[PDB]
RNA sequence: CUCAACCUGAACUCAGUCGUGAUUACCCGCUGAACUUAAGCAUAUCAUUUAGCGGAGGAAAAGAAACUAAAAAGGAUUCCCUUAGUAACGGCGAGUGAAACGGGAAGAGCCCAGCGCCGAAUCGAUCAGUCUUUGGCUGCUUCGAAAUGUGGCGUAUAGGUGUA
RNA sequence: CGGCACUGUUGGUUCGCUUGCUCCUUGGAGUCGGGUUGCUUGAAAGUGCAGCCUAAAGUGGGUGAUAAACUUCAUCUAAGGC
RNA sequence: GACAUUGUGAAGAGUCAGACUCU
């Protein structure tokens, strides 16, 4: 099908053709607002494999995120502590730029539900993602028994709780000994379990 | 944006879409295509109640549909719109058609082609 | 200030442990709640076994435990085929299917095939519509003795048997067990060096 | 080997409790990785369309000059791993051979 | 230059929706100290913790292996006992510190993209009938979404064609 | 007020399912991986997370807890979802 | 200072064997 060809073509981001297209598109994106509604996905096949359907109730937004580390917000780099906490500059955020972009889209659009997002462009200053969202109250969504899951209260603001694909990557979930720190579904839960003092009834 | 697309150097595989069928050849192509337009809304209305009381040749559309036809060498002629945006949707067709020896031309107007098919684009 | 002969202290109480304390005063309450849940489930799914699906037999993984068997997650598709049970049919008649496990040894496959066979022998199938039975469904007076089963389905026996006394054979005595063990250890340990020597000899 | 005094060995090259082996059949999940014919056609056509990346072009120049070690080091630095560097170098060497045969 | 498409972007007290703000015991994502211990103190410790910000539910999160392991092998997630104050980390100082196997509670499995086939077979509003009407069912109702592809089969246990 | 079980009725729906043979077919990219920086872990020539640079392949990719080549294998199938 | 953002042409010098490097 054509979708396989689109996927393979998009895999070649250093080719002349895709470099030209990305240059044009990045220039265009830099002139718009930070969060901006998009008429249609820029990468229909990527959106499809992330879960998008060309059906009423699915919407696409483009979010621009500033690149680089996260400077510690202190006055004149004054931390007032031991030297181990003096770092101000080479400090990296715990969440990825994609996760931050999904968070911005979700915060702005409170009545929709963030489904996913994908990379569309980047320059030295910005990274551009497109977030696919769903309107949980459109009947085209509520009557389809396959998208009904996202219309339930337990999925409110998934990006603010780190449940989207981009969000989960930062939580360190997985199987095996490499991911044993998050047994129970979260590092905080596992830490609580390991650091609770247990007093059995008969001891 | 229009100015930038001319100012920058365009790679050949992107530039091939700028040179489209000339006016006369395009008119001939559309004249041929208009003979096999899909079923109209009024035709559907009139046929529905007759069938309730009781598939010719047609132009096929859609990249995935056209891509399969080309790979199976079942299509005789393929017309590709020149203003497809995003362009990656049809970036492969000119080379794919030429690889399977299927005649193809980049005709002007995804909206003109959509009219032939009773669609938007 | 420890004084005299003492074991050096090790108590891990230097954190704010008073914020994370778990007591077990609700242990009998939890026991009662789980018994009540089992009773409710039994009423809900009677006459099906309260335990639920039938589980498979499994050898414990490591050599420290490989002489013991235990209940597994389910039956492999190879075992289901050997017992002549479809996976779809097993899901309906209440047999656990382990879609990840595969059998690499005839003895392991056969044990579970026999387990499936005895479960089928002990099974009682009610007619899909009480008015009209069909083929495979159990007989009328069989459906009267039906009773809910409690505990594991086909529980495993852990009794240990002792081999019968026998005669000490001469060939048994003439074997050098310690020399054999040390020879095996040496052969495994020096296998690679001998291969290197053989390759060098061939090259010369 | 089983016999007088031996019912199985817990150590050595022939250790293991005796058991009968069933014939081995590949699991379905193992099939992932094989290129389909259509996928190979797609990849070759997309290569023809898009072309080469800048580091690929540099490696092609090195291979034309026959600096295999320099190409390997460059690909190790860029791609990162010896395995991947070897794979990419072999593919680009095939490209060079095909170009030579086609043109000259 | 006329008319008509599409694309992109607007304005509407246009028709009908939805979000905001509370609560803290538990839950999810971030941000993030110092007192204190080291008989001083800077790494370390306190602590991936007070404090700060955001987001849900009756539970949440996790969850159906890019797993454990190296047996004659186990087989989603969650929780308990044990492993164990162990392997390991640490001015190798003060201190810190898991997991698998094993015994149990409970146990339930699945859906896409892609490939391929049917190919718009799919869907929202509106109108008219009809019912058990705080919502459903029927359409030559009229509009619109959808070929930059909605629906059907189908997802690693594979799947599909024909055939018995 | 609920939960059931059986009867009737109303509306929708069912060319399917299993096993053998036959032929065909079969997959997620600025992602993985690599360098470096910072945090974090019991994880020790890097356990997890992230910034920047680099940037894939297709029996390929990951993993097998001491780094690297060359070898025996074993085990899964990441970058989508309930 | 290096890398990325960073594109399109000329002249000189130097490497190679039409590319690269600089200015």
Short mmCIF file of N, CA and C in Angstrom, two decimals, chain C residues 139-201:
data_model
loop_
_atom_site.label_atom_id
_atom_site.label_comp_id
_atom_site.label_asym_id
_atom_site.label_seq_id
_atom_site.Cartn_x
_atom_site.Cartn_y
_atom_site.Cartn_z
N UNK C 139 -25.30 -37.24 30.96
CA UNK C 139 -26.60 -37.89 31.03
C UNK C 139 -27.40 -37.36 32.22
N UNK C 140 -28.70 -37.69 32.21
CA UNK C 140 -29.62 -37.08 33.16
C UNK C 140 -29.25 -37.41 34.60
N UNK C 141 -29.09 -38.69 34.93
CA UNK C 141 -28.75 -39.04 36.30
C UNK C 141 -27.33 -38.64 36.66
N UNK C 142 -26.45 -38.48 35.67
CA UNK C 142 -25.15 -37.88 35.94
C UNK C 142 -25.30 -36.44 36.41
N UNK C 143 -26.23 -35.70 35.81
CA UNK C 143 -26.43 -34.31 36.19
C UNK C 143 -27.05 -34.15 37.57
N UNK C 144 -27.49 -35.24 38.20
CA UNK C 144 -28.03 -35.15 39.55
C UNK C 144 -26.94 -35.19 40.61
N UNK C 145 -25.88 -35.98 40.39
CA UNK C 145 -24.79 -36.06 41.36
C UNK C 145 -23.85 -34.88 41.28
N UNK C 146 -24.10 -33.92 40.40
CA UNK C 146 -23.21 -32.77 40.26
C UNK C 146 -23.11 -32.01 41.57
N UNK C 147 -21.89 -31.70 41.98
CA UNK C 147 -21.64 -30.95 43.20
C UNK C 147 -20.49 -29.98 42.98
N UNK C 148 -20.55 -28.85 43.67
CA UNK C 148 -19.50 -27.85 43.54
C UNK C 148 -18.22 -28.36 44.20
N UNK C 149 -17.11 -28.21 43.49
CA UNK C 149 -15.82 -28.67 43.99
C UNK C 149 -15.09 -27.51 44.65
N UNK C 150 -14.54 -27.76 45.84
CA UNK C 150 -13.80 -26.77 46.59
C UNK C 150 -12.34 -27.17 46.68
N UNK C 151 -11.47 -26.18 46.67
CA UNK C 151 -10.04 -26.42 46.59
C UNK C 151 -9.58 -26.54 45.16
N UNK C 152 -8.30 -26.86 45.01
CA UNK C 152 -7.72 -26.99 43.68
C UNK C 152 -8.40 -28.11 42.91
N UNK C 153 -8.51 -27.91 41.60
CA UNK C 153 -9.05 -28.94 40.72
C UNK C 153 -7.96 -29.96 40.43
N UNK C 154 -8.25 -31.23 40.69
CA UNK C 154 -7.25 -32.29 40.57
C UNK C 154 -6.01 -31.91 41.35
N UNK C 155 -6.09 -31.84 42.68
CA UNK C 155 -4.92 -31.43 43.46
C UNK C 155 -3.77 -32.40 43.31
N UNK C 156 -2.56 -31.87 43.42
CA UNK C 156 -1.36 -32.67 43.24
C UNK C 156 -0.98 -33.36 44.54
N UNK C 157 -0.41 -34.55 44.41
CA UNK C 157 0.05 -35.33 45.55
C UNK C 157 1.55 -35.12 45.73
N UNK C 158 1.96 -34.85 46.97
CA UNK C 158 3.36 -34.58 47.29
C UNK C 158 3.97 -35.66 48.16
N UNK C 159 3.38 -36.85 48.19
CA UNK C 159 3.94 -37.94 48.98
C UNK C 159 5.21 -38.47 48.34
N UNK C 160 6.15 -38.89 49.19
CA UNK C 160 7.46 -39.36 48.76
C UNK C 160 7.50 -40.87 48.93
N UNK C 161 7.87 -41.57 47.86
CA UNK C 161 8.00 -43.01 47.87
C UNK C 161 9.47 -43.41 47.98
N UNK C 162 9.70 -44.63 48.44
CA UNK C 162 11.04 -45.17 48.63
C UNK C 162 11.23 -46.36 47.71
N UNK C 163 12.32 -46.36 46.95
CA UNK C 163 12.60 -47.46 46.05
C UNK C 163 12.74 -48.76 46.83
N UNK C 164 12.26 -49.84 46.23
CA UNK C 164 12.31 -51.12 46.89
C UNK C 164 13.76 -51.56 47.09
N UNK C 165 14.09 -52.19 48.21
CA UNK C 165 15.44 -52.72 48.37
C UNK C 165 15.76 -53.71 47.26
N UNK C 166 17.01 -53.70 46.81
CA UNK C 166 17.45 -54.56 45.73
C UNK C 166 18.83 -55.11 46.06
N UNK C 167 19.41 -55.83 45.11
CA UNK C 167 20.73 -56.42 45.28
C UNK C 167 21.80 -55.47 44.77
N UNK C 168 22.94 -55.44 45.45
CA UNK C 168 24.06 -54.61 45.03
C UNK C 168 24.80 -55.35 43.92
N UNK C 169 24.78 -54.79 42.72
CA UNK C 169 25.38 -55.45 41.56
C UNK C 169 26.88 -55.19 41.51
N UNK C 170 27.60 -56.16 40.94
CA UNK C 170 29.06 -56.08 40.91
C UNK C 170 29.54 -54.92 40.04
N UNK C 171 28.91 -54.74 38.88
CA UNK C 171 29.28 -53.63 38.01
C UNK C 171 29.09 -52.30 38.71
N UNK C 172 28.06 -52.19 39.55
CA UNK C 172 27.87 -50.97 40.32
C UNK C 172 29.07 -50.69 41.21
N UNK C 173 29.57 -51.72 41.89
CA UNK C 173 30.67 -51.53 42.82
C UNK C 173 31.96 -51.18 42.09
N UNK C 174 32.21 -51.79 40.94
CA UNK C 174 33.48 -51.53 40.24
C UNK C 174 33.61 -50.12 39.67
N UNK C 175 32.57 -49.29 39.73
CA UNK C 175 32.68 -47.95 39.16
C UNK C 175 33.42 -47.04 40.13
N UNK C 176 34.20 -46.11 39.59
CA UNK C 176 34.95 -45.14 40.39
C UNK C 176 34.23 -43.80 40.32
N UNK C 177 33.37 -43.54 41.31
CA UNK C 177 32.46 -42.41 41.23
C UNK C 177 33.21 -41.09 41.37
N UNK C 178 34.13 -41.00 42.33
CA UNK C 178 34.86 -39.75 42.52
C UNK C 178 35.75 -39.46 41.32
N UNK C 179 36.45 -40.47 40.82
CA UNK C 179 37.27 -40.27 39.64
C UNK C 179 36.41 -39.83 38.47
N UNK C 180 35.23 -40.42 38.33
CA UNK C 180 34.32 -40.02 37.26
C UNK C 180 33.93 -38.55 37.38
N UNK C 181 33.54 -38.13 38.59
CA UNK C 181 33.12 -36.75 38.77
C UNK C 181 34.25 -35.78 38.47
N UNK C 182 35.46 -36.08 38.96
CA UNK C 182 36.59 -35.20 38.70
C UNK C 182 36.96 -35.20 37.23
N UNK C 183 36.83 -36.34 36.55
CA UNK C 183 37.09 -36.39 35.12
C UNK C 183 36.11 -35.52 34.35
N UNK C 184 34.83 -35.57 34.72
CA UNK C 184 33.85 -34.73 34.05
C UNK C 184 34.14 -33.25 34.28
N UNK C 185 34.45 -32.88 35.52
CA UNK C 185 34.80 -31.49 35.80
C UNK C 185 36.00 -31.06 34.97
N UNK C 186 37.05 -31.88 34.94
CA UNK C 186 38.25 -31.52 34.19
C UNK C 186 37.96 -31.40 32.71
N UNK C 187 37.16 -32.31 32.16
CA UNK C 187 36.87 -32.26 30.73
C UNK C 187 36.12 -30.99 30.38
N UNK C 188 35.12 -30.63 31.18
CA UNK C 188 34.41 -29.38 30.91
C UNK C 188 35.34 -28.18 31.05
N UNK C 189 36.20 -28.19 32.07
CA UNK C 189 37.04 -27.03 32.34
C UNK C 189 38.09 -26.83 31.25
N UNK C 190 38.64 -27.92 30.73
CA UNK C 190 39.72 -27.85 29.75
C UNK C 190 39.26 -28.07 28.33
N UNK C 191 37.95 -28.13 28.09
CA UNK C 191 37.47 -28.39 26.73
C UNK C 191 38.06 -27.39 25.74
N UNK C 192 37.97 -26.09 26.04
CA UNK C 192 38.41 -25.09 25.09
C UNK C 192 39.90 -25.12 24.80
N UNK C 193 40.72 -25.32 25.84
CA UNK C 193 42.16 -25.36 25.65
C UNK C 193 42.56 -26.50 24.72
N UNK C 194 41.93 -27.66 24.88
CA UNK C 194 42.23 -28.78 24.01
C UNK C 194 41.83 -28.49 22.57
N UNK C 195 40.72 -27.79 22.36
CA UNK C 195 40.34 -27.42 21.00
C UNK C 195 41.36 -26.48 20.38
N UNK C 196 41.84 -25.51 21.17
CA UNK C 196 42.89 -24.63 20.66
C UNK C 196 44.13 -25.42 20.28
N UNK C 197 44.53 -26.37 21.12
CA UNK C 197 45.69 -27.19 20.81
C UNK C 197 45.47 -27.99 19.54
N UNK C 198 44.27 -28.56 19.38
CA UNK C 198 43.97 -29.34 18.18
C UNK C 198 44.05 -28.48 16.93
N UNK C 199 43.51 -27.26 16.99
CA UNK C 199 43.57 -26.38 15.83
C UNK C 199 45.01 -26.02 15.50
N UNK C 200 45.83 -25.72 16.51
CA UNK C 200 47.23 -25.42 16.25
C UNK C 200 47.95 -26.62 15.64
N UNK C 201 47.68 -27.82 16.15
CA UNK C 201 48.30 -29.02 15.60
C UNK C 201 47.91 -29.20 14.14
#
